[PDB]
Amino acid sequence: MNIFEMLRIDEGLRLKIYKDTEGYYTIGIGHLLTKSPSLNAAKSELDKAIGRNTNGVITKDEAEKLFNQDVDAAVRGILRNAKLKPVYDSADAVRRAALINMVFQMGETGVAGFTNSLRMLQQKRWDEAAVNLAKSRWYNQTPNRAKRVITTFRTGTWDAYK
Ligand SMILES: [Cl-]
Ligand SMILES: [Cl-]
């Protein structure tokens, strides 16, 4: 199992513009287009990301291509973050994956927010972290996804996703 297959599971794959759990215009494998309410704003951003006149519809390959960039960007965004980086370097491979997932979902910023959870992960206090991670709007809005991610942090294995 790796980050890609993990995020593909959590994010899905949709070839036509859609609105995410949050109501955001999305496409492909969890690619957020805009938080704007405008559909047009959406298709514009899409056209811009793809480099062609889409009419809100993309190919498989195109989704996978936005997918690689966005995983790249999430990683980059961890290794660039004074707060994240230390946690990520402290962790084992599986748990690095779980961190990336969160960062792909919620943004670097979003995650850098979890001060206490982070310190917890850094310390390798798995059970505690998991209960702190759980007291969050993230958990209460996307509980099954969240549970997947927290289990992964707890266990350091891919069970949740098998
Ligand atoms: Cl882009
Ligand atoms: Cl969920």
Swiss-Prot record:
InterPro entries in the record: Endolysin_T4_type, Glyco_hydro_24, Lysozyme-like_dom_sf, Lysozyme_dom_sf, Phage_lysozyme-like, T4-type_lysozyme
Entries under CDD domains matching the protein: T4-like_lys (cd00735)
Recorded consequence of changing residue 20 to C: Nearly no effet on specific enzymatic activity
Lineage: superkingdom: Viruses
Positions of the catalytic residues: 11, 20
This enzyme's EC code(s): 3.2.1.17
pH dependence of function: Optimum pH is 7.3.
Enzyme superclass (EC): hydrolase
Binding annotation for substrate: 32, 104, 117, 132
A cellular component annotation (GO) from this entry: host cell cytoplasm
Catalytic activity annotation: Hydrolysis of (1->4)-beta-linkages between N-acetylmuramic acid and N-acetyl-D-glucosamine residues in a peptidoglycan and between N-acetyl-D-glucosamine residues in chitodextrins
Coiled-coil regions, chain positions: none
Effect upon mutating residue 26 to E: Complete loss of activity at neutral pH; covalently bound substrate
Effect in UniProt of substituting residue 20 to E/Q: Loss of 99% of enzymatic activity
Phenotype when changing residue 20 to A/N/S/T: Complete loss of enzymatic activity
GO biological process per UniProt: cell wall macromolecule catabolic process; defense response to bacterium; peptidoglycan catabolic process; viral release from host cell by cytolysis
SS bonds (residue pairs): none
A GO molecular function held by the record: lysozyme activity
Induction trigger: Expressed late in the viral replication.
Protein family (similarity comment): Belongs to the glycosyl hydrolase 24 family.
Function: Endolysin with lysozyme activity that degrades host peptidoglycans and participates with the holin and spanin proteins in the sequential events which lead to the programmed host cell lysis releasing the mature viral particles. Once the holin has permeabilized the host cell membrane, the endolysin can reach the periplasm and break down the peptidoglycan layer.
Listed name of the protein: Endolysin
Source organism per UniProt: Enterobacteria phage T4
